[PDB]
């Protein structure tokens, strides 16, 4: 038996594998084996055959594929090039399956920012230089839809930085109708928005400048419009604009989501710039004028009296089989998010689930069943389990399909469904070794094991792993949920050093039953430390009071919760009081800096990796969702009295390590620059390190360097 090593974590050795089937029908799915071959599996017949060999993939150096619903053409993608967290560009080739040769005559240009098949048939829509092009057939000249697309100014069919990162969390902004006879897209205008500029060095004599339109807290915002166009005769009347509700089009507003109900019925969701109110609208198609109409009687309003609307994002509706009623998750009269059924009016909604727990997600609404996720089982808010409810049946029914499958190995589930919910797949992430299984779909009976991760289990037999526990504390009528990681051969009669890992971000959760082998695991296994994570007020999935306790006051209660948890841990009786440390990343940097400079004398050293300095330096959407406008009339006082720099005097008797990357676009380098300037102006000693031309993720060898440096720092403090 041997302990973990740093090189084991850095060069990923103990990493699991998952299996998400690529459903192409109600009974078939595609996969890529460990031979670069694309194989089609049929469940009913049980046979399989290859639809694309590795020779064809290697012929054009392809790395990804996409199959048309007709199973006549495939597209292969090469020349991958990442731009932001979600967006990238590539080069696409089209392969004909019937004739076994590439399509010749009209090749797609390059690079291409997004590409999608139609749901029915084989016709393509793609985005090239912020413009949308439509192809009726893969061997036809394209038809151009938009003309005003300009780099860094106007975006057609794709989001800008703000919407991609904070609102949509996707790389595309175009949607096909269910039968593919209409196409809906969004146009973003970024012309008055201020620009953030930084320096990129590269390998050349002179460095260059990178400019991004970036609205900070209180600045101007993009302008978004929505269009729908007919894909059979696009030249008849051209694109049509969807009307905005009168109550929304009175000030600045946002765009939340779009979802198709039918070929003549679409749904849109709007948010006000003040995130207190959200509106859901349903629009229909008028054939006598070839246009779209949104009646006022089909508007639904959701508002929150004590905080923002929804969680991190606004919930999306799932429509029934009759396409006139839907199901949605929002908070009930007791402040718990549950499922409601809406037919005509919001005030007539029917509550489907109730209790002192929360519903997380809605997966599928079939003709007679509803699948969802919850943490109801045994009142553990860190687990996820899948429940199935019968709808439209004479006796009501409700069952839990995952809480007794593998009780001691799997308590954190996710699901993926096929067409018409004939079959589905369950993926389990912890607390045991992750697993992936295929289920019947009508009787919830196991069929085959897609992924078992036997090699990892064989590799982990000769390794001593730390012991993890999840418990709770009750302090001052507030319940805190903590996860404790203890070294092997733990003895309660000795004293151990303590390290705290903090994120603390709003609408987040850090205490989950998820399997992972990471840096803190190595720290506990080899260096003999005790690690702890604490979840307190401001987090999600425990009620509206706990979630909204931190409204308009950021950086006040998280520090108190961390300090209270540390004091309780010290009172437990096996913690060395003179060796305690704390660290975090990009919101735990903020909380770590605020807790280290709290003047309580509890922490000895702290680490802040790419922290946020002041809320005036971050994006408008995220900041204004939880803080409000930074004006003298509304919330300027707390904007001023919340920065890290204001505590610069209290860093005198502690050890501080500050790390940031110079080419960061999410949390800009100016935060760390201002922190360092404030610390210097007060004559306080600290340490620092920068990474050149590195983004927010610090990918590559920068990760090895960062973790080695942090290990050295921690080993020096606890010596």
């Amino acid at each position, epitope marked *: 038996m041997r302990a973990l090593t740093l090189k084991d974590i850095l060069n990923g050795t103990f990493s699991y594998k998952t299996f998400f089937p690529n459903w192409i029908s109600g009974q078939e799915y595609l996969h890529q084996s460990a031979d670069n071959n694309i194989v089609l599996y049929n469940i009913e017949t049980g046979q399989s055959y290859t639809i694309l060999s590795n020779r064809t993939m290697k012929s054009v150096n392809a790395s990804n594929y996409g199959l048309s619903p007709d199973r006549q053409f495939v597209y292969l993608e090469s020349d991958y090039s990442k731009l932001w967290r979600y967006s990238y560009t590539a080069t696409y080739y089209i392969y004909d399956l019937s004739n076994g040769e590439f399509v010749r005559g009209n090749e797609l240009p390059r690079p291409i920012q997004y590409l999608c098949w139609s749901p029915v048939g084989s016709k393509l829509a793609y985005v090239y230089q912020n413009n949308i092009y439509l192809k009726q057939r893969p061997g036809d000249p394209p038809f151009q839809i938009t003309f005003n697309g300009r780099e860094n100014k106007i975006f057609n069919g794709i989001p800008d930085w703000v919407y991609e990162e904070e609102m949509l969390a996707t790389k595309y902004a175009l949607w096909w109708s269910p039968n593919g006879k209409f196409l809906a897209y969004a146009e973003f205008n970024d012309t008055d928005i201020p620009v953030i500029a930084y320096s990129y060095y590269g390998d050349e004599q002179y460095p260059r400048t990178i400019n991004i339109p970036y609205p900070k807290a209180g600045a101007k915002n993009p302008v978004v419009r929505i269009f729908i166009i007919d894909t059979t*005769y*696009p*030249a*008849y*009347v051209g694109p049509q604009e969807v009307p905005v509700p009168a109550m929304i089009a009175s000030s600045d507003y946002y765009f939340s989501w779009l979802t198709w109900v039918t070929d003549e019925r679409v749904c849109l969701q709007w948010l006000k710039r003040v995130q207190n109110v959200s509106v859901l609208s349903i629009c229909d198609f008028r*054939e*006598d*004028w*070839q246009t779209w109409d949104c009646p006022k009687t089909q508007e639904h309003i959701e508002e929150s009296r004590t905080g923002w609307a929804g969680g991190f994002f606004v919930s999306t509706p799932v429509f029934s089989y009759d396409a006139i009623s839907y199901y949605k998750i929002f908070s009930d009269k007791d402040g718990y998010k549950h499922i409601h059924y809406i037919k005509d009016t919001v005030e007539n909604a029917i509550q489907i689930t109730s209790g002192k727990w929360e519903a997380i997600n809605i997966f599928r609404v079939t003709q007679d069943s509803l699948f969802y996720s919850s943490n109801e089982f045994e009142e553990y808010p860190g687990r996820r389990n899948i429940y199935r409810i019968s709808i439209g049946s004479y006796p009501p029914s409700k069952k839990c399909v995952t809480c007794h499958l593998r009780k001691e190995r799997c308590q954190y589930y996710t699901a993926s469904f096929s067409d018409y919910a004939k079959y589905y797949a369950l993926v389990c992430y912890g607390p045991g070794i992750p697993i992936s299984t295929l289920h019947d779909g009508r009787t919830d009976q196991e069929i085959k094991i897609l992924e078992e991760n036997k090699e990892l289990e064989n590799a982990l037999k000769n390794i001593q792993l730390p012991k993890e526990e999840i418990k709770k504390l009750e302090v001052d009528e507030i319940t805190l949920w903590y996860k404790m990681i203890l070294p092997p051969q733990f003895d309660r009669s000795k004293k151990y050093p303590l390290l705290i890992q903090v994120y603390g971000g709003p609408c987040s959760q850090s205490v989950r039953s998820v399997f992972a082998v990471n840096w803190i695991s190595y720290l506990a296994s080899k260096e003999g430390m005790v690690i702890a994570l604490v979840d307190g007020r401001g987090t999600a999935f425990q009620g509206d009071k706990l979630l909204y306790a931190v409204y308009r006051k950021l950086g006040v209660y998280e520090v108190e919760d961390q300090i209270t948890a540390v004091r309780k841990f010290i009172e437990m009786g096996f913690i060395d009081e003179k060796r305690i440390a704390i660290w975090g990343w990009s919101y735990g940097g903020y909380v770590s800096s605020l807790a280290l400079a709290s003047g309580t004398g509890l922490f000895k050293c702290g680490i802040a990796v790419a922290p946020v300095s002041s809320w005036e330096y971050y994006a408008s959407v995220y900041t204004e969702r939880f803080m409000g406008l930074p004006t003298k009339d509304d919330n300027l006082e707390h904007y001023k009295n919340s920065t890290v720099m204001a505590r610069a005097e209290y860093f005198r008797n502690v050890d501080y390590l500050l790390i940031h990357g110079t080419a960061d676009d999410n949390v800009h380098f100016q935060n760390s620059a201002q922190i360092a300037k404030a610390l210097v102006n007060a004559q306080v000693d600290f340490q620092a390190m920068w990474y050149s031309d590195q983004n927010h993720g610090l990918s590559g060898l920068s990760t090895n360097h960062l973790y080695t440096h942090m290990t050295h720092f921690l080993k020096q403090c606890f010596s």
Partner: nanobody, 122 residues
């Protein structure tokens, strides 16, 4: 259904023209009428629409302020007059019959005739 279009031809830019549409078979004065054009190498483009009574007219954004459409139910004729032409309207014009006479309604893809060719160049 029978429809015949007359007029058009080759004309220099900046001129003016007018063309007529005559329909038979169905009952006139009970449906809205429309004028559509087809350009070489392009698809069908809707130009203008006229109500079944002749009170209100609708025009596209590309021919706004330059085309005038009228009808006469006594002679069962439809007239469209173009003025201040530009060297991009060279196309063949078709006469379309709607399916709703209760009010104005753009015909989607109903009956099509042979149309008349109009070419403008220097």
């Amino acid at each position: 259904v029978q429809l015949v279009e007359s007029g058009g031809g080759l004309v220099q830019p900046g001129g003016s023209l007018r063309l007529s549409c005559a329909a038979s078979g169905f009952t006139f004065s009970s449906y809205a009428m429309s004028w559509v054009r087809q350009a070489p190498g392009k698809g069908l483009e809707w130009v203008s629409a006229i109500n079944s009574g002749g009170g209100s007219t609708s025009y596209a954004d590309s021919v706004k302020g330059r085309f005038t459409i009228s009808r006469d139910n006594a002679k069962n004729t439809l007239y469209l007059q173009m003025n201040s032409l530009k060297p991009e309207d060279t196309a063949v014009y078709y006469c379309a019959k709607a399916r709703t006479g209760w009010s104005l309604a753009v015909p989607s893809f109903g009956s099509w005739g042979q149309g008349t060719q109009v070419t403008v160049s220097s």
